[PDB]
């Protein structure tokens, strides 16, 4: 099992705490020795994320056996396996937050068997433990099978709880950097948008087109789009009459949650992957590349933040399944949210496509774009005062020309 | 001897084509005696555009005219300059321009010329506008080489020295014109890169929020370490040293390089900028780069440096 | 010994404790007699090096080697070996101090101690300095040998990680709060149109928890430039005297017509004053009127022992309140005209 | 391309169901409950994780903490 | 005892001289000089480094830099 002078594995592990911690090589290196110490056949690492307020566990390192290399055990972003938080031993570990081990899988309850068909493995024994940041779980590490015995004993639990201190430290500093990386950008976009919304009074169309153009870099996305609704509640008398007399049958389409017709009169879209092409389309046709999917006309009714993970496999919305460009560019992720104007009235819809890392949107990219749209919704006070000024001035001119 | 192919490129509006003129007109095929044929219209357009832009920026910068009556004059100008022809400066134009420049209010705007965009040579021109407006004026050679125009296309120049055959190409410095650089990349012997020393507190024409020194450094670092030009050598040129000498005292270096400290002189920061423009090279000792200061309008320094450059090209 | 002190970074990173236990070992390995630690910070554009651990020796404890914020020694980085090291960003080894041009006996008169040999190095995060460590006074040889200079570097590789973690955690702390103040100020600025006196009272009051202060004050300036004809007559007729006070960089006269002040220790006690007297507990020092003459960001470190201004000592309040640190900056309105001072 | 998971073209899941979308947040209360548990990295930010402004106003008697019963 | 620094009043200092104060922040830019050699924690944030655009648009020829000058 070991001797005392033989514990130079401590020095071998400390030798890599020198510089530029990649946070992927170090975990692999400690697992490749923990596999030998425990006398197990396979080890794996699942990572934790949250979408739509619901937790998920996605694999990051798979089949890390003894004498293996890094490049054949790193899971690409689009070849993952995603588990809900209630199914399997992994879900049980994440819910209970304590180390578990099953001497026999078949007799035990809530043992799933989905992976045993994809990867044709038998999974006779399981031992798992979580790693915490303090009240929060950050990853799960599992060991499968035993080299030459019935099951894992208690001494192996002692070994794991002793050598897990070198990974509780690596995984925690990889988590802080992400939070810093998101807070910086959240501060910057608010500051730079406040620079451009206090420069001049003008109409709503120009203000959004000067506030969204300045923050291209901070939102690393390929394309995004904004659509503006119409605010005319009640029409004149000479337009209602044809309906109440037996012509032009009444409206049949959808309605906002306070009563209106859902009509987009302007659409702004930005393309930032091939070459910058900013365009404005008045009165867009119902086959514009943003409006076909039916998502921006579903957000306007319910008013719910919607997050989609694999668009070409969704059934409810029927996105496109072919490239939309000469080069091969296809939709893979979508996120949409509404804009409100201090009286719980929807004024527009914003949509973002295809994050620039290949990975789907998560919590730390929901909060940023929720704060952006909150600020944009609050900032609609200025365009109204423009109209009020441009009416007061004309009324004053008329009444001053009446006295002359 | 067998053939020499030189390419000139660099940041836009840096005086690349001024070297082409200062070489071709001065040395080979003779000067242009009938210079007025183009220089009349060119200088008239430059001098009109400069004083139009200054008054257009007056309102933006909220500076108020020195005298009340001046407020009338500008208006007249902005109406009567629209329906005028090109390359003509009638007395009605010259009188208004001279009267406007004879003010203590326009000087306030002209002192702060970093915020907006004006041609740099214009400050030398308009002061002697009368010399232009007098009939029969034929420009001086120094006035000839201070004109301005947008170098756009690819042009072949044939310098001669050391009994060699030369072919010089130059290209536009804007972002759009950068696509055309690829055609002349293949099969070259040397490359020349141009930098303007004065532009440490200015902004790009295309993008309003990007500095110019940073743009030049990012442009340089890309091709400097590339393997396409590994075989060939690179020659660096620094222009606008006169305006650099003038300005370098006026404003600090902290705006462009945030962490600089000390007191600025015409030579203390020169090595700073040169070492920061040469550290970007990856191969420290495999390849070497040379940079020289240059005033394009002058001829003495051109003769001092161009022959040495050709000799160094010969040495290899 | 190394597995211990890795068992101590499990939660709530302890910058003081773990570095102390590293230094207690590094002092024994090198046969040195003392060790230290200097921290790096910047005030109003200039850099300096404070003190955080002093005179650590192999058998000391944590209580007799931790320096509180009041018993400090601050070195500008153009004085001494410490400044030379923190400026050059390289290791320094000094066999004898009688010859080095860079040396100071200032720290030897206070502590009654004599130094002969020195060995020091910086600690780097990327391109920035975070600290400096010293290994004064070797006990057996004439000076530090050349074989110790590699033990030093190869053994400080573990303390480098801890100090980098501390520095990173500190930067996450001061960027979380910058988003919140902006968001919760926009929230109360975009509620309705109002005059200036009410915006600066709604917005400065709802972010009083993120700003970790005890008192702060805001002063507003008059915005009228040209006077009336019936007021310029007395001056031109010998009836009065021309103005002679300070002037704002655009010519206006400096007079405050409102002062909003907040007290945040003990009682909330918000207040407004319609016309401040000649001696208010804020305007009396003279800093708010020196800031208005020329727009400067000012930062005083030891207020009771300054000479240019006058922060008179003795508590202003019954509970006992002495000013010790002050910061003040102007407010500009996109037209380059001062509107107030905070 | 083994890929170590035998899946290519997109993520796979054990079970599928109707989509569920998150709801907005309106009230945005300031205060927080008292804090329990181990600390971990990334906490102790002054402005956040607190009720009101200070402890003294909440419990005015707490100032006399060091004093004994009799006084 | 005396906190091991033998000073109790306040921060002492070797130097003396006239105070120097900072200038206000007038103009801002989106650009930074190109990166140096060595990097540490917190130096990879998107949008906080470079010129705000990918290097392809500024230098189109660098797109297909894999293929040499033969074609
Ligand atoms: N004062 C001064 N101006 C200079 C000097 N060198 C060049 N210039 C200016 O540079 C201008 C000519 O540069 P450009 O015509 O723009 O040539 P370019 O560098 O190829 O830039 P583009 O034409 O836009 O492609 C002249 O009008 C001069 O004002 C110099 O040494 N001193
Ligand atoms: N092929 C393979 N399967 C694993 C590995 N680690 C865990 N699993 C399986 O993945 C399953 C996921 O949910 P489970 O029900 O907890 O039981 C788990 C094991 O059957 C591994 O390293 N290789
Ligand atoms: N008494 C004492 N002096 C120290 C210690 N560490 C550094 N110094 C001295 O303090 C001085 C501060 O700057 P210096 O002049 O570069 O050289 C330094 C040493 O002489 C210490 O631990 N104890």
Curated annotation (Swiss-Prot), chain A:
What quaternary structure, including any partners, is listed in this protein's UniProt entry?
Answer: Oligomer composed of two catalytic chains (alpha and beta), an inhibitory chain (gamma) and the delta chain.
Protein name in UniProt: Rod cGMP-specific 3',5'-cyclic phosphodiesterase subunit alpha
User: What is the primary gene name for this protein?
Assistant: PDE6A
Instruction: Describe the task this protein carries out.
Output: Rod-specific cGMP phosphodiesterase that catalyzes the hydrolysis of 3',5'-cyclic GMP. This protein participates in processes of transmission and amplification of the visual signal.
For this chain, the family text in UniProt reads: Belongs to the cyclic nucleotide phosphodiesterase family.
Residue numbers of the full-length protein present here:
52 to 455 of 859
Question: Could you tell me where this protein is found in the cell?
Answer: Cell membrane; Cell projection, Cilium, Photoreceptor outer segment
Domain GAF, which positions? 22-171, 203-380
What's the source species for this entry? Bos taurus (Bovine)
From which domain of life does this come?
A: Eukaryota
Curated annotation (Swiss-Prot), chain B:
Q: So where does Mg(2+) get bound?
A: 17, 151
Positions of region (G3 motif): 166-175
Can you list the GO cellular component terms from the UniProt entry? cytoplasm; G protein-coupled receptor complex; heterotrimeric G-protein complex; photoreceptor disc membrane; photoreceptor inner segment; photoreceptor outer segment membrane
Q: Where in the cell is it found?
A: Cell projection, Cilium, Photoreceptor outer segment; Membrane; Photoreceptor inner segment
The answer to whether keyword Lipoprotein applies is yes
Can you supply a Gene Ontology BP term from the record? phototransduction
GO MF assignments: acyl binding; G protein-coupled receptor binding; G-protein beta/gamma-subunit complex binding; GDP binding; GTP binding; GTPase activity; metal ion binding; protein kinase binding
How does the record say this protein sits in the membrane? Answer: Peripheral membrane protein
Q: Which residues carry this modification: Phosphotyrosine?
A: 116
Q: Could you tell me which residue ranges the G-alpha domain spans?
A: 2-316
Q: What does this protein do?
A: Functions as a signal transducer for the rod photoreceptor RHO. Required for normal RHO-mediated light perception by the retina. Guanine nucleotide-binding proteins (G proteins) function as transducers downstream of G protein-coupled receptors (GPCRs), such as the photoreceptor RHO. The alpha chain contains the guanine nucleotide binding site and alternates between an active, GTP-bound state and an inactive, GDP-bound state. Activated RHO promotes GDP release and GTP binding. Signaling is mediated via downstream effector proteins, such as cGMP-phosphodiesterase.
Q: What is this protein called?
A: Guanine nucleotide-binding protein G(t) subunit alpha-1
Protein species of origin = Bos taurus (Bovine)
Give the source lineage, highest ranks first: Eukaryota, Metazoa, Chordata, Craniata, Vertebrata
Swiss-Prot record, chain C:
Can you give the residue ranges of the GAF domain?
14-163, 195-342
Q: Which domain of life is it from?
A: Eukaryota
Subcellular location, record wording: Membrane; Cell projection, Cilium, Photoreceptor outer segment
The UniProt function text for this chain reads: Necessary for the formation of a functional phosphodiesterase holoenzyme. Involved in retinal circadian rhythm photoentrainment via modulation of UVA and orange light-induced phase-shift of the retina clock. May participate in processes of transmission and amplification of the visual signal. Rod-specific cGMP phosphodiesterase that catalyzes the hydrolysis of 3',5'-cyclic GMP. Necessary for the formation of a functional phosphodiesterase holoenzyme. Involved in retinal circadian rhythm photoentrainment via modulation of UVA and orange light-induced phase-shift of the retina clock. May participate in processes of transmission and amplification of the visual signal.
Give the multimer and partner information. Answer: Oligomer composed of two catalytic chains (alpha and beta), an inhibitory chain (gamma) and the delta chain.
Q: Which family does it belong to?
A: Belongs to the cyclic nucleotide phosphodiesterase family.
Q: What is this protein called?
A: Rod cGMP-specific 3',5'-cyclic phosphodiesterase subunit beta
Q: Which organism is it from?
A: Bos taurus (Bovine)
Q: What is the lineage of its organism?
A: Eukaryota, Metazoa, Chordata, Craniata, Vertebrata
Of the parent protein, the shown chain spans 58 to 399 of 853
From Swiss-Prot, chains D, E:
Annotated region Disordered: where?
Answer: 1-46
GO molecular function terms attached to this record: 3',5'-cyclic-GMP phosphodiesterase activity; cGMP binding; molecular adaptor activity; zinc ion binding
Catalytic activity reported: 3',5'-cyclic GMP + H2O = GMP + H(+)
The Enzyme Commission number assigned here is 3.1.4.35
Composition-biased stretches, type Basic residues, lie in 17-35
- The answer on whether this UniProt entry bears the keyword Cell inner membrane reads no
> GO biological process: any one?
positive regulation of MAPK cascade
Keywords from the UniProt entry:
Acetylation, cGMP, Hydrolase, Sensory transduction, Vision
One GO cellular component term: photoreceptor outer segment membrane
Q: What do we know about how this protein assembles, alone or with others?
A: Oligomer composed of two catalytic chains (alpha and beta), an inhibitory chain (gamma) and the delta chain.
Family, according to the entry, reads as follows: Belongs to the rod/cone cGMP-PDE gamma subunit family.
* Biological role: Participates in processes of transmission and amplification of the visual signal. cGMP-PDEs are the effector molecules in G-protein-mediated phototransduction in vertebrate rods and cones.
Q: What is this protein called?
A: Retinal rod rhodopsin-sensitive cGMP 3',5'-cyclic phosphodiesterase subunit gamma
This chain's source organism reads: Bos taurus
**Whole protein: which stretch is covered?**
10 to 80 of 87
């Amino acid at each position: 099992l070991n001797s005392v002078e033989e514990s130079e594995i401590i020095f071998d592990l400390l030798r890599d705490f020198q510089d530029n911690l990649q946070a992927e090589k170090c975990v692999f290196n400690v697992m490749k020795k923990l596999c030998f110490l425990l006398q197990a056949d396979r080890m794996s690492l699942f990572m934790y994320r949250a979408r739509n307020g619901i937790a998920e566990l996605a694999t990051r390192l798979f089949n890390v056996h003894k004498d293996a290399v890094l490049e054949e055990c790193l899971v690409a972003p689009d070849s993952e396996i995603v588990f809900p938080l209630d199914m399997g031993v992994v879900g049980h570990v994440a819910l209970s937050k304590k180390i578990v081990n099953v001497p026999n899988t078949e007799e035990d309850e809530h043992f799933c068997d989905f992976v045993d068909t994809l990867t044709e493995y038998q999974t006779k024994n399981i031992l798992a433990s979580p790693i915490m940041n303090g009240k929060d779980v950050v990853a799960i590490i599992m060991v499968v099978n035993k080299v030459d015995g019935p099951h894992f004993t208690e001494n192996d639990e002692e070994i794991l709880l002793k050598y897990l201190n070198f990974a509780n430290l690596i995984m925690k500093v990889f988590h802080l950097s992400y939070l810093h990386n998101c807070e910086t950008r959240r501060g910057q976009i608010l500051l730079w948008s406040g620079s451009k919304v206090f420069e001049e009074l003008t109409d709503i169309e120009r203000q959004f087109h000067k506030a969204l153009y300045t923050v291209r870099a901070f939102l690393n996305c390929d394309r995004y789009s904004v659509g503006l609704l119409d605010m005319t509640k009640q029409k004149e008398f000479f337009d209602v009459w044809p309906v109440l007399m037996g012509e032009a049958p009444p409206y049949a389409g959808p309605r906002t949650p306070d009563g209106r017709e859902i009509n987009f009169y302007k659409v702004i879209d930005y393309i930032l992957h091939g070459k910058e092409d900013i365009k404005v389309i008045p009165n867009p046709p119902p086959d514009h590349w943003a409006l076909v999917s039916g998502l921006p006309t579903y957000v306007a009714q319910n008013g719910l933040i919607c997050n989609i993970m694999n668009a070409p496999s969704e059934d409810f919305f029927a996105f496109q399944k072919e490239p939309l460009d000469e080069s091969g560019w296809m939709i893979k992720n979508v996120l949409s949210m509404p804009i409100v104007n201090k009286k719980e009235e929807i004024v527009g819809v914003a949509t973002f496509y295809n994050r620039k890392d290949g990975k789907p949107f998560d919590e730390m990219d929901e909060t940023l774009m929720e704060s952006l749209t909150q600020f944009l919704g609050w900032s609609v006070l200025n365009p109204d005062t423009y109209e009020l000024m441009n009416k007061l001035e004309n009324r004053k001119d008329i009444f001053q020309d009446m006295v002359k | 001897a067998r053939t020499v192919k030189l390419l000139l490129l660099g940041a836009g509006e840096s005086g690349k084509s001024t070297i082409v003129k200062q070489m071709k007109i001065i040395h080979q095929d003779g000067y242009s005696l009938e210079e007025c044929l183009e220089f009349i219209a060119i200088i008239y357009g430059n001098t009109l555009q400069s004083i139009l832009a200054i008054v257009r920026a007056m309102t933006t910068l909220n500076i108020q005219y020195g005298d009340s009556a001046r407020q009338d004059d500008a208006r007249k100008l902005m109406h009567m300059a629209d329906t005028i022809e090109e390359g003509t400066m009638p007395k009605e134009m010259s009188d208004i321009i001279q009267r406007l420049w004879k003010d203590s209010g326009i000087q306030a705007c002209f002192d702060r010329a970093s915020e907006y965009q004006l041609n740099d040579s214009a400050g030398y021109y308009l002061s002697d506008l009368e010399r232009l407006v007098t009939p029969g004026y034929v420009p001086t050679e120094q006035d000839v080489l201070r004109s301005c125009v947008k170098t756009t296309g690819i042009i072949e120049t044939q310098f001669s020295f050391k009994d060699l055959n030369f072919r010089m190409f130059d290209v536009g410095g804007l972002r759009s014109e950068r696509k055309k650089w690829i055609h002349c990349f293949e099969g070259v012997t040397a490359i020349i890169f141009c930098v303007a020393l004065s532009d440490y507190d200015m902004v790009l024409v295309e993008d309003d929020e990007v500095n110019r020194m940073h743009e030049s450094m990012h442009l340089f670092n890309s091709i400097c370490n590339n393997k396409w030009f590994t075989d060939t050598s690179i020659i660096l040129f620094l222009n606008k040293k006169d305006l650099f000498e003038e300005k370098i005292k006026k404003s600090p270096l902290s705006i462009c390089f945030p962490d600089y400290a000390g007191s600025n002189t015409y030579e203390e920061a020169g090595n700073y900028i040169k070492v920061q423009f040469l550290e970007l090279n990856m191969r420290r000792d495999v390849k070497e780069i040379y940079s020289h200061m240059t005033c394009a309008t002058d001829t003495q320094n051109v003769k001092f440096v161009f022959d040495a450059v050709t000799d160094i090209i010969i040495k290899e | 010994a190394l597995f211990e002190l890795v068992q101590d970074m499990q939660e709530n990173v302890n910058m003081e404790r773990v570095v102390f236990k590293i230094l207690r070992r590094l002092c024994s390995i090198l046969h040195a007699d003392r060790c230290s630690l200097f921290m790096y910070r910047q005030r109003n554009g200039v850099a300096e090096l404070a003190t955080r651990l002093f005179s650590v020796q192999p058998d000391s404890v944590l209580e007799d080697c931790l320096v509180p914020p009041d018993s400090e020694i601050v070195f500008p980085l153009d004085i001494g070996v410490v400044g030379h090291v923190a400026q050059t960003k390289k290791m320094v080894n000094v066999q004898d101090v009688m010859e080095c041009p860079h040396f100071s006996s200032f720290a030897d008169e206070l502590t009654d101690y004599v130094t002969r040999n020195i060995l020091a190095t910086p600690i780097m995060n990327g391109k920035d300095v975070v600290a400096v460590i010293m290994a004064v006074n070797k006990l057996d040889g004439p000076c530090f040998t050349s074989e110790d200079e590699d033990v030093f570097l190869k053994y400080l590789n573990f303390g480098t990680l801890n100090l980098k973690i501390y520095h990173l955690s500190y930067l996450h702390n001061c960027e979380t709060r910058r988003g919140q103040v902006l968001l919760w100020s926009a929230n109360k600025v975009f509620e309705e149109l109002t005059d200036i006196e009410r915006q600066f009272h709604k917005a400065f009051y709802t972010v009083r928890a993120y700003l970790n202060c005890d008192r702060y004050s805001v002063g507003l300036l008059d915005m009228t430039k040209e006077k009336e004809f019936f007021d310029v007559w007395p001056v031109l007729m010998g009836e009065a005297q021309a103005y002679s006070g300070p002037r704002t960089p655009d010519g206006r006269e400096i007079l405050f017509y409102k002062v909003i002040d907040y007290i945040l220790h003990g009682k909330e006690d918000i207040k407004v004053i319609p016309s401040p007297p000649a001696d208010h507990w804020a305007l009396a020092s003279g800093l708010p009127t020196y800031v208005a003459e020329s727009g400067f960001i000012c930062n005083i470190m030891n207020a009771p022992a300054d000479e240019m201004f006058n922060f008179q000592e003795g508590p202003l309040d019954d509970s006992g309140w002495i000013v010790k640190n002050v910061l003040s900056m102007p407010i500009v309105n996109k037209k380059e005209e001062i509107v107030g001072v905070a | 391309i083994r890929s170590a998971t035998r899946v290519m073209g997109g993520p796979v899941t054990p079970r599928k169901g109707p989509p569920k979308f998150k709801q907005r947040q309106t009230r945005q209360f300031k205060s927080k409950p008292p804090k329990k548990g181990v600390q971990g990295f990334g906490d102790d930010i002054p402005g956040m994780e607190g009720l009101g402004t200070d402890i003294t106003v909440i419990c005015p008697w707490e100032a006399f903490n060091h004093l004994e019963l009799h006084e």
